[PDB]
Design an enzyme around this catalytic site. Structure first.
Site, PDB file in Angstrom:
ATOM      1  N   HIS A   1      81.719  53.567  58.038  1.00  0.00           N
ATOM      2  CA  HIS A   1      82.459  52.475  57.611  1.00  0.00           C
ATOM      3  C   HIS A   1      81.548  51.203  57.968  1.00  0.00           C
ATOM      4  CE1 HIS A   1      86.263  54.878  58.874  1.00  0.00           C
ATOM      5  NE2 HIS A   1      85.971  55.083  57.428  1.00  0.00           N
TER       6      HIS A   1
ATOM      7  N   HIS B   1      82.077  47.401  59.385  1.00  0.00           N
ATOM      8  CA  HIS B   1      83.084  46.680  60.108  1.00  0.00           C
ATOM      9  C   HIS B   1      82.579  45.248  60.134  1.00  0.00           C
ATOM     10  CE1 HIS B   1      84.714  50.408  62.468  1.00  0.00           C
ATOM     11  NE2 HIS B   1      83.795  50.810  61.805  1.00  0.00           N
TER      12      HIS B   1
ATOM     13  N   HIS C   1      87.663  46.644  60.939  1.00  0.00           N
ATOM     14  CA  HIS C   1      86.853  47.128  59.809  1.00  0.00           C
ATOM     15  C   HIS C   1      86.772  45.990  58.741  1.00  0.00           C
ATOM     16  CE1 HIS C   1      87.771  51.306  60.839  1.00  0.00           C
ATOM     17  NE2 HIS C   1      87.335  51.716  59.603  1.00  0.00           N
TER      18      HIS C   1
ATOM     19  N   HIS D   1      93.849  51.285  55.157  1.00  0.00           N
ATOM     20  CA  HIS D   1      92.867  52.260  54.981  1.00  0.00           C
ATOM     21  C   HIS D   1      92.877  53.229  53.979  1.00  0.00           C
ATOM     22  CE1 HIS D   1      89.296  54.523  56.607  1.00  0.00           C
ATOM     23  NE2 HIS D   1      90.039  55.606  56.347  1.00  0.00           N
TER      24      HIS D   1
ATOM     25  N   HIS E   1      90.088  49.544  52.508  1.00  0.00           N
ATOM     26  CA  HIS E   1      89.329  48.344  52.841  1.00  0.00           C
ATOM     27  C   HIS E   1      87.969  48.346  52.079  1.00  0.00           C
ATOM     28  CE1 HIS E   1      90.777  49.409  57.306  1.00  0.00           C
ATOM     29  NE2 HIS E   1      91.909  48.938  56.336  1.00  0.00           N
TER      30      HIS E   1
ATOM     31  N   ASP F   1      85.539  50.803  53.455  1.00  0.00           N
ATOM     32  CA  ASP F   1      85.725  52.320  53.684  1.00  0.00           C
ATOM     33  C   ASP F   1      85.049  53.020  52.962  1.00  0.00           C
ATOM     34  OD1 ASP F   1      88.014  51.791  55.120  1.00  0.00           O
ATOM     35  OD2 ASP F   1      89.365  51.850  53.669  1.00  0.00           O
TER      36      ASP F   1
ATOM     37  N   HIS G   1      80.782  57.521  62.731  1.00  0.00           N
ATOM     38  CA  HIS G   1      81.830  57.800  63.617  1.00  0.00           C
ATOM     39  C   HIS G   1      81.855  59.075  63.985  1.00  0.00           C
ATOM     40  CE1 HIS G   1      84.293  53.887  63.257  1.00  0.00           C
ATOM     41  NE2 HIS G   1      83.809  53.834  62.295  1.00  0.00           N
TER      42      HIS G   1
ATOM     43  N   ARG H   1      82.461  55.119  67.556  1.00  0.00           N
ATOM     44  CA  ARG H   1      81.294  54.587  67.045  1.00  0.00           C
ATOM     45  C   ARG H   1      80.224  55.535  67.539  1.00  0.00           C
ATOM     46  NH1 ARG H   1      78.845  48.545  68.484  1.00  0.00           N
ATOM     47  NH2 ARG H   1      76.705  49.103  68.472  1.00  0.00           N
TER      48      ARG H   1
END
Lengths: 153, 153
Positions: free
Chosen positions: A46, A48, A63, A71, A80, A83, A120, A143
């Site tokens: 992702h 952020h 995000h 999401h 997003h 994403d 992640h 993370r």
């Protein structure tokens, strides 16, 4: 024309380098690189919203979601901007990334330059996990490594 | 206002957090923060063109010089965009940074967001060092700590 790179680093074994390239401002962004030190399987991948404002930050932070959507997966219209779904690690823990995205950009309002790429802990359920947290983060968990997306040579 | 932040990280004891703020897109950029782990005295403080494309990079790459000028001090008209001069470390090795600059911007075509802020081994001679390297880098020497300039919350 526009080229970018994120060096993924963390307090752990996960490290990698991801390249971004976008030949036209209306065109897709090619995303390629690799990440090592991963557990075998799928890991959320992702963008952020912000760069780290501390040393050894553990939080992923919000995000990148300027349009305030729920999401989703990268194929979904409801998602997003950040994403990018899941990367897949092999049995050795190496994940070679080779995707194309038409939602992120390296210029304009949805520019991800100066924002943070994060791989992640767990697989992104793509908003289809059946709880409230699924529509926020995909239940991708913590993370493992991150890098600010910077302009590349 | 546009906000940015760079987390200066290195292999040695040199670390810091530098914030950027710009109230007006054609106004000055406020640069402030702190760097520790430095030797007492002047240390070159520059924005370089590219983010790392490698893990544990020891080189600070080209200076950010989109207008193709010669190296100078921040007060000079002949300077690179990324020529932010020197920070000064006290006897405890801490440099309190408090700069204002009207050449750098956080927006537009030559925005420093996505570029690398670097604190250097030794003082920038501001182009007045009496050799060729002086007018290129100011002889500030090796990179001690660096971070990509990211978007701040």
């Amino acid at each position: 024309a526009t080229k970018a790179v994120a060096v993924l680093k963390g307090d752990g074994p996960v490290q990698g380098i991801i390249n971004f390239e976008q030949k036209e401002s209306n065109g897709p962004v090619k995303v390629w690189g690799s990440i090592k030190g991963l557990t075998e399987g799928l890991h959320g991948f992702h963008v952020h919203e912000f760069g780290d404002n501390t040393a050894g930050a553990t939080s992923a932070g919000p995000h990148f979601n300027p349009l305030s959507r729920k999401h989703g997966g990268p194929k979904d219209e409801e998602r997003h901007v950040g994403d990018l779904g899941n990367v897949t690690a092999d049995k050795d823990g190496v994940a070679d990334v080779s995707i194309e995205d038409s939602v992120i950009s390296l210029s304009g309002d949805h520019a991800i330059i100066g924002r943070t790429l994060v791989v992640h802990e767990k697989a992104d359920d793509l908003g289809k996990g059946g709880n409230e947290e699924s529509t926020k983060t995909g239940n991708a968990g913590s993370r493992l490594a991150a890098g600010v997306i910077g302009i590349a040579q």
